[PDB]
Amino acid sequence: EKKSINECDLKGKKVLIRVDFNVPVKNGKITNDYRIRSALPTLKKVLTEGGSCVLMSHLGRPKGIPMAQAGKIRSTGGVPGFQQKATLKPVAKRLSELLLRPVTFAPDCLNAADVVSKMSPGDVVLLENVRFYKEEGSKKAKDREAMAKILASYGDVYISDAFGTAHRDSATMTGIPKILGNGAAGYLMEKEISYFAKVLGNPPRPLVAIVGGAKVSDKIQLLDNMLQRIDYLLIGGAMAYTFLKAQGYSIGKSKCEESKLEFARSLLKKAEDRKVQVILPIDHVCHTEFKAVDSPLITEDQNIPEGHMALDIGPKTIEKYVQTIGKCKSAIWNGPMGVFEMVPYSKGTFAIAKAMGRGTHEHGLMSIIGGGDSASAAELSGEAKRMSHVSTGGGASLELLEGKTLPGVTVLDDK
Ligand SMILES: Nc1ncnc2c1ncn2[C@@H]1O[C@H](COP(=O)(O)OP(=O)(O)C(F)(F)CCCC(F)(F)P(=O)(O)O)[C@@H](O)[C@H]1O
Numbered sequence: 001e002k003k004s005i006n007e008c009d010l011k012g013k014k015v016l017i018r019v020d021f022n023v024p025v026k027n028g029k030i031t032n033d034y035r036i037r038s039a040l041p042t043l044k045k046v047l048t049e050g051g052s053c054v055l056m057s058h059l060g061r062p063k064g065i066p067m068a069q070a071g072k073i074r075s076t077g078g079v080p081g082f083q084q085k086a087t088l089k090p091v092a093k094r095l096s097e098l099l100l101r102p103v104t105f106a107p108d109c110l111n112a113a114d115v116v117s118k119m120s121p122g123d124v125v126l127l128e129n130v131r132f133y134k135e136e137g138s139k140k141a142k143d144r145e146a147m148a149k150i151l152a153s154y155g156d157v158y159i160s161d162a163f164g165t166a167h168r169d170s171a172t173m174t175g176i177p178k179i180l181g182n183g184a185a186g187y188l189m190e191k192e193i194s195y196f197a198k199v200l201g202n203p204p205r206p207l208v209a210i211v212g213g214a215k216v217s218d219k220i221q222l223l224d225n226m227l228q229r230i231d232y233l234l235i236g237g238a239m240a241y242t243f244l245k246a247q248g249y250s251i252g253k254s255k256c257e258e259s260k261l262e263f264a265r266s267l268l269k270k271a272e273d274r275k276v277q278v279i280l281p282i283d284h285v286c287h288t289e290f291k292a293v294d295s296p297l298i299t300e301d302q303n304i305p306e307g308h309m310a311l312d313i314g315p316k317t318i319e320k321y322v323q324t325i326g327k328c329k330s331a332i333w334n335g336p337m338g339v340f341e342m343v344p345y346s347k348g349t350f351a352i353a354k355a356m357g358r359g360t361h362e363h364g365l366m367s368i369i370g371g372g373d374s375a376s377a378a379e380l381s382g383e384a385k386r387m388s389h390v391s392t393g394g395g396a397s398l399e400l401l402e403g404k405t406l407p408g409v410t411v412l413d414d415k
Pocket residue numbers: 164212213214215218236237238255310311312334335336337338339340341370371372373374392393394395396398
């Protein structure tokens with residue numbers, strides 16, 4: 001429905017592409033270039049059609065500085081809002097290595113008129129982190145419009161390929177296409193829009209929703225919209241403990257939301273009424289503190305020892321969840337099953353990714369993972385390629401599933 005890069009005239013065009021180059025960096029070295037690799041097909045398409053690329057992206061969460069202060073800063077020769085930890089310079093080098101062509105780095109995204117003017121078809125320029133400027137994500141349209149005006153002057157056509165930031169207005173996601181008068185979806189964005197439209201339409205049944213994460217409160221709108229569309233609901237992460245506590249199980253020192261015990265009981269009641277089969281953990285991996293240990297305690301059932309906090313779903317739960325996924329034709333997953341950040345509490349999350357990938361590879365299951373650590377698990381274990389779709393935006397994918405429209409999608413042209 002939305003116009004894609006394949007429908008754009010690109011020959012001789014200077015193409016502004018909002019990419020997702022938010023890669024993890026440590027001591028100045030990229031520790032995972034997966035996102036850069038995923039951006040290649042969109043860039044290759046522009047180059048193949050005879051255009052040039054002016055790439056825009058953010059890295060980390062820099063403080064940012066107001067545009068007004070930029071003038072002073074530039075006179076001193078400095079870069080406005082610069083922060084070594086969040087510079088895109090190493091990303092430019094890695095991109096060049098992957099594309100096997102030069103990539104000119106423009107150290108200030110709002111002061112690149114000259115380098116941009118000298119660009120020829122086939123060139124690739126990566127502007128410095130757009131979040132070095134406060135107006136990039138400002139709540140004021142005028143703030144975003146001012147920054148976007150400068151960026152829009154750097155090109156002819158706009159391509160959006162950073163779904164993870166599409167759920168919020170920003171100079172780069174919504175300002176530019178507005179000012180420019182055109183905008184289309186890159187290959188990653190195109191796939192995101194398609195798959196979520198599929199899941200909210202009439203996906204193949206049975207459909208199971210696997211929901212995890214740290215809080216039930218963060219997933220209530222998801223449940224509000226999805227309960228009437230699914231057959232199974234598998235709950236994991238700390239979200240599960242509020243439910244288990246509400247039902248009457250001992251949860252020890254596990255993370256929970258006392259303010260949501262009533263909600264949990266009402267939800268379980270609603271699910272039964274709608275005949276949705278809800279499955280909560282039947283065992284847990286726990287420890288006496290929020291730290292990694294080689295041989296964490298594994299419970300025999302739903303009950304958690306006093307003095308222990310559950311940090312991942314246990315072996316029996318994994319078995320049950322995997323078996324349930326095996327009965328479905330569609331599976332949507334949002335939120336990790338445990339503390340994925342720590343190796344001994346990552347098994348549950350890896351297991352769901354394994355079941356989903358196998359389901360698709362061997363039976364055609366429509367598997368969609370909504371970003372975050374759940375997507376990371378799939379990526380690290382090589383299951384991402386076997387999945388129907390692994391989203392790059394946790395927050396954005398959840399909002400679509402809540403039934404909300406995304407500013408970054410709406411702003412694009414229709415085909
Ligand atoms: N047993 C347990 N005890 C305590 N904590 C537990 C737990 N099990 C899981 N957790 C914690 O819950 C967190 C993830 O929950 P979340 O709701 O923020 O994630 P999400 O739905 O993946 C998301 F989509 F919101 C993630 C957003 C991703 C992003 F911001 F990067 P985006 O840019 O892609 O939007 C993790 O930090 C994890 O350690």
